[PDB]
């Protein structure tokens, strides 16, 4: 056995590790799955693309741009309401 590897930055390393763990896979298992999929398909079996917001995100963005958001006077008051009092300051 030999190795397949890539150099990646820390943010990418952690974000990838979180998706992979939560999918029930070690990093090695995920890369092996990708390499075998590329062999099986004779190509990258998905389109390469930038992140695209899902419907829920698009809905939030649409609510904001239409001026239907919710105001808050400070980050602190917003934290008190959104955490139901768990973090009342900073």
């Amino acid at each position: 056995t030999e190795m397949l590897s890539t150099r990646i930055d820390h943010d990418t390393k952690i974000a990838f590790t979180n998706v992979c763990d939560e999918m029930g896979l070690s990093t090695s298992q995920a890369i092996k799955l990708f390499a075998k999929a590329v062999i099986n398909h004779g190509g990258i079996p998905f389109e390469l693309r930038v992140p695209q917001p899902n419907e829920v995100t698009a809905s939030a963005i649409q609510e904001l741009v239409e001026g239907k958001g919710h105001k808050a006077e400070s980050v602190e008051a917003m934290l008190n309401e959104l955490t139901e009092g768990k973090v009342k300051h900073v």
Binding site: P51, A60, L79
Partner: protein
């Protein structure tokens, strides 16, 4: 001096999940949002950048590698669309 604070309905729903995180992490969420409210530049680890879609200028930054804030500054409003993992938002 400071932007008005506005958040989507979905942002409040997302913060129900955020509330379950330890206080330290909630404070870090607040610190990032406050930096943005003051118009300040974020730090390199927050990998702050605009999204390259028809997203009316919304931006993406990492409060943690797997905790993403979607937001924009419009007029003098800091508008918070989503907060969560890549899997929740994209």
């Amino acid at each position: 001096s400071m932007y008005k604070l506005e958040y989507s309905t979905q942002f409040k729903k997302d913060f129900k999940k955020i509330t379950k995180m330890p206080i330290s992490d909630i404070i870090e969420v607040g610190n990032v949002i406050s930096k943005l409210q003051r118009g300040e530049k974020l730090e390199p680890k927050n990998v702050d950048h605009p999204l390259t879609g028809n997203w009316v200028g919304f931006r993406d930054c990492h409060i943690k590698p797997d905790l993403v804030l979607i937001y924009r500054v419009f007029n003098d409003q800091l508008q918070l669309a989503r907060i969560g993992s890549q899997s929740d938002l994209f």
